[PDB]
Coordinates of C-alpha atoms in Angstrom, one line a residue:
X12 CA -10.6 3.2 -38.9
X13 CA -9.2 6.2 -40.8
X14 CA -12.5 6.4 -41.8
X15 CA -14.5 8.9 -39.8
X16 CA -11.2 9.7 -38.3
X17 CA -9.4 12.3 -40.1
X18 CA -13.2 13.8 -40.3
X19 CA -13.4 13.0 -36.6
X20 CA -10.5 14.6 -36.0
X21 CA -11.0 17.5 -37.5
X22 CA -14.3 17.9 -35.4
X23 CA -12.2 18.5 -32.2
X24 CA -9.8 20.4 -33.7
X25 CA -12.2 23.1 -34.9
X26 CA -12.7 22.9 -31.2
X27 CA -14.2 26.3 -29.5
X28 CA -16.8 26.4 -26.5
X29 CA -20.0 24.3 -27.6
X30 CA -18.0 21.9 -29.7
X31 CA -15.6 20.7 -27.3
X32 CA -17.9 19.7 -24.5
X33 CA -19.0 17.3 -27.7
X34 CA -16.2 16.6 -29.0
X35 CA -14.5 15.9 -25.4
X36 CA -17.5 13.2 -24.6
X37 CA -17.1 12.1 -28.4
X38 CA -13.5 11.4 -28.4
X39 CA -14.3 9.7 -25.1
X40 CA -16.3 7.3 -27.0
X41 CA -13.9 6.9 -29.6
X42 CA -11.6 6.3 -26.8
X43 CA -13.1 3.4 -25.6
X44 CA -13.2 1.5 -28.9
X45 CA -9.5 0.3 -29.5
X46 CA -10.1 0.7 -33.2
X47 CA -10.4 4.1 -33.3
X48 CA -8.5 4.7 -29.9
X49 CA -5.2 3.7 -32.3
X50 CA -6.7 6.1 -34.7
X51 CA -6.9 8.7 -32.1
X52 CA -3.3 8.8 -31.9
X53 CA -0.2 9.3 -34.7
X54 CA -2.8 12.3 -35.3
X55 CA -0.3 15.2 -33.5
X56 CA -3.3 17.9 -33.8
X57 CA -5.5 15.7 -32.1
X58 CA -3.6 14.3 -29.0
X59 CA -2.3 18.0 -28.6
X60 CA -5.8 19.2 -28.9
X61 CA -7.1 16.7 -26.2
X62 CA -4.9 18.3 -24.0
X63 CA -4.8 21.7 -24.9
X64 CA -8.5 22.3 -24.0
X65 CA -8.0 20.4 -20.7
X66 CA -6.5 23.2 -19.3
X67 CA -8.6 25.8 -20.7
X68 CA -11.7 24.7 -20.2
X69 CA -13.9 25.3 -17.5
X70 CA -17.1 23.3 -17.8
X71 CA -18.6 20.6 -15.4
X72 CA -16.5 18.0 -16.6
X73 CA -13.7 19.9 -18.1
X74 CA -11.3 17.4 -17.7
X75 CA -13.1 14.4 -17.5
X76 CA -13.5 13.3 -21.1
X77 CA -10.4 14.9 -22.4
X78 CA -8.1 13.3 -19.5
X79 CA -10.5 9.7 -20.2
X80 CA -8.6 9.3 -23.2
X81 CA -5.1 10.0 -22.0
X82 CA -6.1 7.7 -19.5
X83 CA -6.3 5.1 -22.1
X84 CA -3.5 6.6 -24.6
X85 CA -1.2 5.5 -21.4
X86 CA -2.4 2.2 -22.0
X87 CA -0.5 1.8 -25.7
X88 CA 3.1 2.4 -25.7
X89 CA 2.5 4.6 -28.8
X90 CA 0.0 6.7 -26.7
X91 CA 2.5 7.2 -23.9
X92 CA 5.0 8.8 -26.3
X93 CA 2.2 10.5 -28.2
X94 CA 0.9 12.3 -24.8
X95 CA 5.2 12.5 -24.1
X96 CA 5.4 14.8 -27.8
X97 CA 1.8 16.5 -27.2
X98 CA 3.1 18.1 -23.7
X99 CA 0.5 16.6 -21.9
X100 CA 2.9 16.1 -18.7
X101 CA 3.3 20.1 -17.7
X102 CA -1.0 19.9 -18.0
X103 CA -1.3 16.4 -16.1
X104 CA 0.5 17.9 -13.3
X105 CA -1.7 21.2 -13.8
X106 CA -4.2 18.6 -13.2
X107 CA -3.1 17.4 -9.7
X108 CA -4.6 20.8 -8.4
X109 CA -8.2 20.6 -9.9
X110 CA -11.0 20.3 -7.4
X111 CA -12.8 16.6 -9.4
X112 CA -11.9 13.4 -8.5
X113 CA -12.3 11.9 -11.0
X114 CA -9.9 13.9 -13.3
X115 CA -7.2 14.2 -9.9
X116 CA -7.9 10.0 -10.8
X117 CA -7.0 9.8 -14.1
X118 CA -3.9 12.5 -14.1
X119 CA -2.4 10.5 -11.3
X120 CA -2.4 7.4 -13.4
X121 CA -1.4 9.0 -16.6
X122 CA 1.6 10.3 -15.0
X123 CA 2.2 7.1 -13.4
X124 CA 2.1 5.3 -16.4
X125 CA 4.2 7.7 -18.0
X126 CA 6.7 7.3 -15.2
X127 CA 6.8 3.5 -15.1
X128 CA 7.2 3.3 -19.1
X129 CA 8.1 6.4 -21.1
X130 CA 12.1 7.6 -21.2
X131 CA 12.4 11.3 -19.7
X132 CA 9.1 11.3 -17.9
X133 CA 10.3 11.5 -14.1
X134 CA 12.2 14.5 -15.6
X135 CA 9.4 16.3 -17.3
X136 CA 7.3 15.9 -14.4
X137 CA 9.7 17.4 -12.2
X138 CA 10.2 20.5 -14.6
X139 CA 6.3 20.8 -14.5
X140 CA 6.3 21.2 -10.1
X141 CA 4.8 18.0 -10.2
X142 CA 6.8 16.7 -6.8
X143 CA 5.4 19.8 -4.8
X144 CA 1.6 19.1 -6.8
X145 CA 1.8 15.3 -5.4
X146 CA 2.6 16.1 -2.0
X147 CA 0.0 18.5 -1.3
X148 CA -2.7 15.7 -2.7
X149 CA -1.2 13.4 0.0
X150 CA -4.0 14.7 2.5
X151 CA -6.6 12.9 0.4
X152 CA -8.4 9.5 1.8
X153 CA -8.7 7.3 -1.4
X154 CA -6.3 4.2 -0.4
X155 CA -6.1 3.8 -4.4
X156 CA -5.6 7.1 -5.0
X157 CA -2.8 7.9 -2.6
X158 CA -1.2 4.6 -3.4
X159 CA -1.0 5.9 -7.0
X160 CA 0.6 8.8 -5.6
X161 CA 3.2 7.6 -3.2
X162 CA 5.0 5.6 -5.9
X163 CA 5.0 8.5 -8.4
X164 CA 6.6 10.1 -5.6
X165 CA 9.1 7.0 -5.1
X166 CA 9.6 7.1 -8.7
X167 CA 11.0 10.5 -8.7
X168 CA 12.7 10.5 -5.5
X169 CA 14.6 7.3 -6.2
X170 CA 18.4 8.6 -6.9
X171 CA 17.8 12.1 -7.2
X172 CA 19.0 14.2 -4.2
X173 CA 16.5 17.3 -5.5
X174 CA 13.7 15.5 -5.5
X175 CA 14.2 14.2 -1.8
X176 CA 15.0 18.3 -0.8
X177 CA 11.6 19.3 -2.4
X178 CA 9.6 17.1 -1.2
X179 CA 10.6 17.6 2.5
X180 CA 10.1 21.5 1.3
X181 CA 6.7 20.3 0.1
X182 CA 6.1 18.8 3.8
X183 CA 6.2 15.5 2.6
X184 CA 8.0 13.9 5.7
X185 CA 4.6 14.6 8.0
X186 CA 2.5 13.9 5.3
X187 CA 3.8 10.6 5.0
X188 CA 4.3 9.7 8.4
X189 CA 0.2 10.4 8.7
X190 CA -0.3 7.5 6.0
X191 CA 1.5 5.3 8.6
X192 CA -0.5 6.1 11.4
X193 CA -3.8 6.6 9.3
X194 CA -4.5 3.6 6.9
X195 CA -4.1 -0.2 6.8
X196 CA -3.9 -0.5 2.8
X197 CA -1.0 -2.9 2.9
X198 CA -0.6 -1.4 -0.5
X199 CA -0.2 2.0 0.3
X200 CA 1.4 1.6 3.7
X201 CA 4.2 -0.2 1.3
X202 CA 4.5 2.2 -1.2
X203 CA 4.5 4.9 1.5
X204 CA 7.2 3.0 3.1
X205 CA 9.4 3.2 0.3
X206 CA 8.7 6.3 0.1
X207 CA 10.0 7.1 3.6
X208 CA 13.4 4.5 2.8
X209 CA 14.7 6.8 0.1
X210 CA 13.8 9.5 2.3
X211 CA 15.5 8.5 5.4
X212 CA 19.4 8.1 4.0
X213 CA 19.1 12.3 3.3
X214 CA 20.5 14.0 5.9
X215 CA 18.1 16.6 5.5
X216 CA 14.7 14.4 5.5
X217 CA 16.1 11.9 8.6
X218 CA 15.3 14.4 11.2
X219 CA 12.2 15.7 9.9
X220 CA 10.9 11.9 9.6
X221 CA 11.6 11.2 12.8
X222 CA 10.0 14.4 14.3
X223 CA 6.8 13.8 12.4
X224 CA 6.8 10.6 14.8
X225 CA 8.1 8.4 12.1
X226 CA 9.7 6.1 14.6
X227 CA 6.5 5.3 16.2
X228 CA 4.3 5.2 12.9
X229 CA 6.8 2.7 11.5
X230 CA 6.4 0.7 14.6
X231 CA 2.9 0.0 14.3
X232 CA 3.5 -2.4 11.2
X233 CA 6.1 -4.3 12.3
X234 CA 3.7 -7.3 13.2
X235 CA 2.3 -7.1 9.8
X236 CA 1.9 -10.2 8.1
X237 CA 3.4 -8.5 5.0
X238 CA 7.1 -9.0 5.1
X239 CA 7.8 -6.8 2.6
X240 CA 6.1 -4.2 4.7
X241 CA 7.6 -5.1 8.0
X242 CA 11.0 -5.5 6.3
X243 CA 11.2 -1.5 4.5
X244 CA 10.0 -0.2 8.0
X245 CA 13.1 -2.0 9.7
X246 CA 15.5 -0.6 7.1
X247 CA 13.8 3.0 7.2
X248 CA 13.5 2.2 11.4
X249 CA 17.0 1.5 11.4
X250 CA 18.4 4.5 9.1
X251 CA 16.5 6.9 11.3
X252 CA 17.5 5.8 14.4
X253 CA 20.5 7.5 14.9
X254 CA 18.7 10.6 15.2
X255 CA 15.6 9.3 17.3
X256 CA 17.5 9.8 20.7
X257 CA 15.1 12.6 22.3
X258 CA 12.1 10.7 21.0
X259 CA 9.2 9.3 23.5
X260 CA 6.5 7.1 23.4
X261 CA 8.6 4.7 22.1
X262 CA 7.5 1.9 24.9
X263 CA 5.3 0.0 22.4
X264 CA 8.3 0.5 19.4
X265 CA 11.2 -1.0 21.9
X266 CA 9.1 -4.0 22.8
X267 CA 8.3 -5.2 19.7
X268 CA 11.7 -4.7 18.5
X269 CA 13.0 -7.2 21.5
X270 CA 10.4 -9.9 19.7
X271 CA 11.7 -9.7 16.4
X272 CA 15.4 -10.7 17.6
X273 CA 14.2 -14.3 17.9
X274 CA 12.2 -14.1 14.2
X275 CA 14.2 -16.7 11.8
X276 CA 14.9 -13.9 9.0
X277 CA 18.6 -12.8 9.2
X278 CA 17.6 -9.2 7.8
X279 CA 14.8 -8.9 10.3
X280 CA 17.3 -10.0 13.1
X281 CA 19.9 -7.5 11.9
X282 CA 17.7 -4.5 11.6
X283 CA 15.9 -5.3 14.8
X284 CA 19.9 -5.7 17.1
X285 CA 20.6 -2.1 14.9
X286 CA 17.5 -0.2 15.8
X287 CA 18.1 -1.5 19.1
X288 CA 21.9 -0.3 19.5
X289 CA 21.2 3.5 18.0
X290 CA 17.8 3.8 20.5
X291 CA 19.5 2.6 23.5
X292 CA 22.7 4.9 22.8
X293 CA 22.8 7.5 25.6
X294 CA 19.2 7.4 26.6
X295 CA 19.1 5.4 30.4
X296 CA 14.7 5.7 29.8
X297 CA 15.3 3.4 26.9
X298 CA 17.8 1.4 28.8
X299 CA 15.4 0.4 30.8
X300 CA 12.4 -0.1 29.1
X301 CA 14.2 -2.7 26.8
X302 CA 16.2 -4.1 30.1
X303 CA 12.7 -4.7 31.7
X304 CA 11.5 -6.3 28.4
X305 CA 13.6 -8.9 28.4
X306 CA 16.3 -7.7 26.2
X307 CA 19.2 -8.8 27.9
X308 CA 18.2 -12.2 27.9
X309 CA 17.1 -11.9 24.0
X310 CA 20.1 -10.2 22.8
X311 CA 22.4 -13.0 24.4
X312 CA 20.0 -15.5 22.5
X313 CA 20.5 -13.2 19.4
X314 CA 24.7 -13.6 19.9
X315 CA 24.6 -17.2 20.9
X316 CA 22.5 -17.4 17.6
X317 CA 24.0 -15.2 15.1
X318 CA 28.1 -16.7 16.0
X319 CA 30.4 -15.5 12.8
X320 CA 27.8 -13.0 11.1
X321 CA 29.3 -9.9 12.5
X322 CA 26.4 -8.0 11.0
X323 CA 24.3 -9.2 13.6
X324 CA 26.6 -9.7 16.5
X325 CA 28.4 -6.1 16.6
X326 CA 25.2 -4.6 16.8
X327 CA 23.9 -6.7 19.5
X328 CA 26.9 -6.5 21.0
X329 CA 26.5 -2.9 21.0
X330 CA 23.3 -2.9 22.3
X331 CA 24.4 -5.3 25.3
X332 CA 27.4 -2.6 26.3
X333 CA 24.6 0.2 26.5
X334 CA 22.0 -1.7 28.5
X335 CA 25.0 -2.8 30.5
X336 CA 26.1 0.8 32.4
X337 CA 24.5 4.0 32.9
X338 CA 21.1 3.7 33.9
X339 CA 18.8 2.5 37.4
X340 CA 19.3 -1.6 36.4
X341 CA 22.2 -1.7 34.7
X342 CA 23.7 -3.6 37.5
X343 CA 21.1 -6.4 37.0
X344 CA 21.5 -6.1 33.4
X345 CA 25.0 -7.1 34.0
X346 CA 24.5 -10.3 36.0
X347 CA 21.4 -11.0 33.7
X348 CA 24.2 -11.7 30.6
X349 CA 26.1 -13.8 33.0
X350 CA 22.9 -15.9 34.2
X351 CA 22.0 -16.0 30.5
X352 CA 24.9 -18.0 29.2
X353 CA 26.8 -14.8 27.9
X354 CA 30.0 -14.0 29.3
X355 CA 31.8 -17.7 27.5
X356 CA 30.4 -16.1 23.6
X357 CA 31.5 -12.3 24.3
X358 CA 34.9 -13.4 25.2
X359 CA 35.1 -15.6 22.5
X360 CA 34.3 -12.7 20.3
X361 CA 37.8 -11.2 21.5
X362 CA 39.3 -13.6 19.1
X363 CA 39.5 -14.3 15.5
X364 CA 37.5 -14.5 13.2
X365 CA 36.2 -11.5 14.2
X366 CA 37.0 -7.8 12.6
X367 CA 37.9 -4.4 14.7
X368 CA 34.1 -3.0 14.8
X369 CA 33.1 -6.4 16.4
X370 CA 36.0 -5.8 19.1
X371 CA 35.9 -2.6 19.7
X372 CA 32.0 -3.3 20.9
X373 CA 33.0 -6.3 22.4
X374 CA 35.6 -4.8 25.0
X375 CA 33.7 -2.0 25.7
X376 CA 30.8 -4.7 26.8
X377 CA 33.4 -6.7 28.6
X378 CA 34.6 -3.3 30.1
X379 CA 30.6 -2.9 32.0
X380 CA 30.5 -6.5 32.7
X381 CA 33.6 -6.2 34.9
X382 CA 31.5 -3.7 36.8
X383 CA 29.9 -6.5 38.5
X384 CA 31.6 -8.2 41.3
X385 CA 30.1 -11.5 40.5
X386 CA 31.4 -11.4 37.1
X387 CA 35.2 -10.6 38.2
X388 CA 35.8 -14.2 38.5
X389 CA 34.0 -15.9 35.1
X390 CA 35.7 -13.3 33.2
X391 CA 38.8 -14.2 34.3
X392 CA 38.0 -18.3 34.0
X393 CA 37.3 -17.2 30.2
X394 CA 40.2 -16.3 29.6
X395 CA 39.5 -12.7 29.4
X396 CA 42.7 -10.7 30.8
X397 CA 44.9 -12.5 28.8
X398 CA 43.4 -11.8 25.4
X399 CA 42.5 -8.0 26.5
X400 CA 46.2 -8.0 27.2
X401 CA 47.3 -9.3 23.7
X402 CA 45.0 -6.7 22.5
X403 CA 46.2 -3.8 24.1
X404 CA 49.9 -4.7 23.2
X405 CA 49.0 -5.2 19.6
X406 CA 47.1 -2.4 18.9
X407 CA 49.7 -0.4 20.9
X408 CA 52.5 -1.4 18.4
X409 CA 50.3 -0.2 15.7
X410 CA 49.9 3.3 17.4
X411 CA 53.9 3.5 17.6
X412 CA 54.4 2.3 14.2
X423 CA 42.3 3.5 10.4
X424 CA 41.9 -0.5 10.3
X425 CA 38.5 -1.6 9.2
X426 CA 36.4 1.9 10.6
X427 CA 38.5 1.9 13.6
X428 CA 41.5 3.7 15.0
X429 CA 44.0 1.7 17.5
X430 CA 44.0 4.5 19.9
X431 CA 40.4 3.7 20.4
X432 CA 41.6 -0.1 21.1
X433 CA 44.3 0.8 23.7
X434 CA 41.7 2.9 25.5
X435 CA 39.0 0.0 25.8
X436 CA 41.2 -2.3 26.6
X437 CA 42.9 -0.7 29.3
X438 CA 39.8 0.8 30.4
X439 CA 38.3 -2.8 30.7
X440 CA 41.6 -3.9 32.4
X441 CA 41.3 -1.0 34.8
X442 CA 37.4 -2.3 35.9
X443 CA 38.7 -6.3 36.3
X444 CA 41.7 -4.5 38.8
X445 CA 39.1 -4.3 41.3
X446 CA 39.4 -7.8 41.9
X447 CA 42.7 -9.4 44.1
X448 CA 43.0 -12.5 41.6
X449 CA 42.6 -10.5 38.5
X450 CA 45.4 -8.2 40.0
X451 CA 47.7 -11.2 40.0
X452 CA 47.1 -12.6 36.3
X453 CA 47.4 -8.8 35.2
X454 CA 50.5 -8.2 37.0
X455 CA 52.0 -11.8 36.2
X456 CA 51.5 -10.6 32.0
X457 CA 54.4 -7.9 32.8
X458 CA 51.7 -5.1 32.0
X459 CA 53.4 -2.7 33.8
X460 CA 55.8 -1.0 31.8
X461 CA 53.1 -0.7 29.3
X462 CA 51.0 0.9 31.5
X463 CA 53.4 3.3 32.5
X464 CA 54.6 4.0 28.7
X465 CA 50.7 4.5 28.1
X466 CA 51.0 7.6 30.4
X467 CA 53.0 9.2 28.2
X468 CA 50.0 8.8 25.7
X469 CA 49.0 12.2 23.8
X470 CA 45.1 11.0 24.8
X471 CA 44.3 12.3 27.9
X472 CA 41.5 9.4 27.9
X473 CA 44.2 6.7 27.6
X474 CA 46.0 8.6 30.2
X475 CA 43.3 8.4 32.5
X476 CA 42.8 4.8 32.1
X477 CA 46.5 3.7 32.3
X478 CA 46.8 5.8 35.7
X479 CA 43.5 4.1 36.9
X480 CA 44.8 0.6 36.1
X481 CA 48.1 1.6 38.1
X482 CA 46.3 3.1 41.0
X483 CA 44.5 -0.4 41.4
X484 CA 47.5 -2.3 41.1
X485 CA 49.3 -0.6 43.5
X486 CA 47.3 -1.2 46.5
X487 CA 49.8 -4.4 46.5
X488 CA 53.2 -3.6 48.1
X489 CA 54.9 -5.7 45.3
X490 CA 53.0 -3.9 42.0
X491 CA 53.2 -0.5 43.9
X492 CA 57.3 -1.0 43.8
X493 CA 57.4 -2.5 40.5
X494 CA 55.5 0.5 39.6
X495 CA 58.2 2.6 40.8
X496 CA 61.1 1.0 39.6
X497 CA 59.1 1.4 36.0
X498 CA 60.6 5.2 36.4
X499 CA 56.0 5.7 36.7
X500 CA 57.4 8.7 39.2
X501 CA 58.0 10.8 36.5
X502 CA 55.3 10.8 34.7
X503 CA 52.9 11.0 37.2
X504 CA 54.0 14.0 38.6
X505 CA 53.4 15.9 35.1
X506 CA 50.4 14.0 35.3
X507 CA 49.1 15.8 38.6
X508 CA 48.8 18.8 36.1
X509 CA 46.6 17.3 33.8
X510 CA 43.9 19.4 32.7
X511 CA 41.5 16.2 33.0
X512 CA 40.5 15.8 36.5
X513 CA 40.1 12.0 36.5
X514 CA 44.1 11.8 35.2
X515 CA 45.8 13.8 38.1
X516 CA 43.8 12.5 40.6
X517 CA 44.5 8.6 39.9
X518 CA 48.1 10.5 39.2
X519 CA 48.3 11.4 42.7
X520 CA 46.8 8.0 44.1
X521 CA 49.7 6.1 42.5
X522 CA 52.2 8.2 43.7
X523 CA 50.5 7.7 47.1
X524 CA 50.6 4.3 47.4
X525 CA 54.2 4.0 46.4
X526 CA 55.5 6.2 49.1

C-alpha cells in the first residue's frame, strides 16, 4: 500500500500544469482501489493537494478527477475528516458554481456526506456562502441532483434562524415552490417538502411561501400515495395558512381538503379541519366553495367523529362558525348542520370535558346557528340557554375577580352575543328571562368593552318587547345606564341603548 504511495504522492504534489491533469486522472485510479484509496488519505499534502488544484485549474475536466476522489474520501469516515482538515468545504461550495455536471454532481454529494456525518460541517458550509450557492442550483432538472440539494438545504436550515433568512434572500421560497409544481420524484418532492416545513414556522419565509403559490403547489400532492409526502404538505399547508387569505385558485386545494376529513389518520384529519378553519377565516369566496363541496356535512362527520380530541374538534368547530355567517349560503350552511345531526354534539361541547379554546369556538358556532329560525327551537331542546347562561355567569365572576389562551371577557361577549341571537325567538325569551339574566345583563352595561356593551343592550332590547321583561328591566335601575349609553361612541350600543329605553316607556 505504502508502497508506490509516498512515491505516488509525491507525484501530485510536485503538481504544476502538465502533471496534474495526470496526476488528477491518476489519483482517480488510485481512488477507485480501496487499497490505495486508504493510502490516499492520512497523507495531509495529498488530500490538501487534491483540493487545492481543484480550484485552480482550468482544464476540461478540472474538477472531475480531483473532486472523483473526494467523492470517495466521503465514503470513509477518515476521508470525511481528512477533506474536513484539508479545507475542501470553502472549495466544494466554490464548486456549486462551475459550469460541469458532473463535478456540480460530486460537490453536492461530498458536502452532503460531510453534512450527514462530519461534526462542524453545516457550519463550515455556511461560512463558505454555500446556502446562497445551493439555492441558485435549484433551477436545475436532475431529480437526483436537486434531491441532493434540497436536503443539504434542510440540513442547514433545520434550527438555525440565519439560514432560513438567507435562503429566502437567496429566493429559495419560489424556487422551491417550482419543485412542487414541476416534478413527481416522490423523493425530491419530500425532501423539498421539508424544506418548505422548516421554512414555513419563520415569519419572514411564511408569506413569501405562500406568494410563490405555495398553497396551491402543496395541494397538488395531497392524493399522493406517499404519506410521508402528503403528511409534511399538511403541516407546511397548515403553518401557512394563516397568511393565505388573499390567495385564489384555491378551488382544487379546498376540495380535496373536505376529502381528507374522512381519511382514518388522526394527523391527516387535524391538519385537514386546521387548514380549513385559517382558509375559511374572513374570506365569504372560500366560504362558499367549501359550503358547496360538501363541508358542512363533512365537518359535522369530522366532530361526531373526533368527540374528546379537542385537537380536531376546535378546529372544526372553527371552521363550522365561519361557513356558518357571512357569505351568499350561510343560511343553508346553518340548517345543513342541523339536518346533519349537529346541533345535539356542538352543545354538548359547551360542557366538560372540554377546555376554553374549544368553547370559545363552540359559542361563537352556536351564536350563527341561532341565526336560523328553524334552529331556535333544537337549540333550546338541547339544552342550550341554560349552559350559555352558566357560562356567561362564570366567566363573568372571573372578570370581577388568561385561562388556557383565552381571556373571560371574550367569554362574556360570546355568550351574550349568542344569547342575544336565540332572543329572537318568544320561547327562548321565556327560558332566558325565567334564569333571572337580567340584572346581569344590565351590570354587563356597565362593562369597559364597548362590544360586551353592545351585546348586553341587544339582548335587553329583545327582551323587552314583553311588557313583563321590559318592567323588570326597569326596575333593574337599566335607565341609568342606558342613557350614558345613548352616548356611546359605538353606533350599535346607543342605538339598542335607545330601543330599550323605548320599549320601557
Amino acid at each position: 500500500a505504502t508502497r508506490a504511495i509516498p512515491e505516488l504522492t509525491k507525484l501530485l504534489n510536485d503538481e504544476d500544469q502538465v502533471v496534474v491533469n495526470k496526476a488528477a486522472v491518476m489519483v482517480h485510479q488510485l481512488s477507485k482501489k480501496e487499497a490505495s484509496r486508504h493510502a490516499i488519505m492520512r497523507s495531509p499534502q495529498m488530500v490538501s493537494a487534491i483540493v487545492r488544484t481543484m480550484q485552480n485549474t482550468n482544464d476540461v475536466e478540472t474538477a472531475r478527477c480531483t473532486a472523483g476522489t473526494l467523492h470517495n474520501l466521503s465514503h470513509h469516515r477518515e476521508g470525511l475528516l481528512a477533506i474536513f482538515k484539508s479545507g475542501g468545504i470553502p472549495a466544494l461550495v466554490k464548486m456549486l458554481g462551475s459550469p460541469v455536471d458532473s463535478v456540480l454532481f460530486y460537490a453536492i454529494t461530498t458536502l452532503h456526506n460531510l453534512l450527514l456525518h462530519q461534526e462542524g460541517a453545516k457550519m463550515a458550509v455556511r461560512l463558505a456562502g454555500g446556502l446562497q450557492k445551493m439555492v441558485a442550483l435549484l433551477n436545475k432538472t436532475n431529480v437526483k441532483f436537486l434531491a441532493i440539494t434540497t436536503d443539504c438545504l434542510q440540513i442547514l436550515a433545520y434550527g438555525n434562524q440565519e439560514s432560513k433568512l438567507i435562503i429566502l434572500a437567496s429566493g429559495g421560497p419560489q424556487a422551491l415552490v417550482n419543485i412542487m409544481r414541476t416534478y413527481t420524484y416522490e423523493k425530491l418532492l419530500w425532501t423539498t417538502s421539508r424544506v418548505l416545513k422548516v421554512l414555513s414556522v419563520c415569519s419572514s419565509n411564511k408569506p413569501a411561501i405562500v406568494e410563490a403559490g405555495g398553497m396551491q403547489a402543496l395541494g397538488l400532492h395531497l392524493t399522493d400515495p406517499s404519506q410521508r409526502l402528503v403528511q409534511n404538505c399538511l403541516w407546511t399547508l397548515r403553518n401557512l395558512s394563516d397568511a393565505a387569505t388573499k390567495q385564489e385558485g384555491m378551488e382544487g386545494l379546498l376540495g380535496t381538503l373536505v376529502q381528507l376529513l374522512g381519511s382514518d389518520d388522526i394527523n391527516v384529519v387535524t391538519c385537514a379541519a386546521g387548514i380549513l378553519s385559517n382558509l375559511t377565516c374572513n374570506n365569504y369566496k372560500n366560504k362558499m366553495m367549501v359550503c358547496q363541496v360538501g363541508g358542512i356535512e363533512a365537518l359535522v362527520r369530522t366532530v361526531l367523529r373526533a368527540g374528546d380530541r379537542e385537537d380536531i374538534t376546535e378546529p372544526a368547530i372553527c371552521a363550522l362558525r365561519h361557513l356558518t355567517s357571512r357569505h351568499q349560503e350561510a343560511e343553508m350552511a346553518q340548517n345543513a348542520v342541523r339536518l346533519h345531526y349537529g346541533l345535539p354534539v356542538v352543545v354538548k361541547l359547551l360542557h366538560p370535558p372540554s377546555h376554553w379554546p374549544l368553547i370559545k369556538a363552540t359559542v361563537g358556532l352556536i351564536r350563527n346557528l341561532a341565526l336560523c329560525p328553524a334552529n331556535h327551537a333544537p337549540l333550546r331542546e338541547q339544552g342550550a340557554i341554560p349552559r350559555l347562561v352558566q357560562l356567561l355567569v362564570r366567566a363573568h365572576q372571573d372578570t370581577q375577580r388568561f385561562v388556557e389562551g383565552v381571556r373571560m371577557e371574550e367569554i362574556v361577549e360570546g355568550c351574550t352575543g349568542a344569547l342575544h341571537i336565540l332572543a329572537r325567538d318568544v320561547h327562548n325569551r321565556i327560558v332566558i328571562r325565567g334564569l333571572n339574566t337580567i340584572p346581569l345583563f344590565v351590570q354587563l352595561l356597565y362593562s369597559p368593552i364597548e362590544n360586551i356593551q353592545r351585546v348586553a343592550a341587544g339582548v335587553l332590547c329583545e327582551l323587552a318587547q314583553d311588557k313583563e321583561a321590559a318592567e323588570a328591566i326597569e326596575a333593574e335601575g337599566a335607565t341609568a345606564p342606558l342613557t350614558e349609553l345613548l352616548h356611546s361612541r359605538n353606533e350599535g350600543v346607543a342605538t339598542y341603548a335607545a330601543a330599550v329605553l323605548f320599549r320601557m316607556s
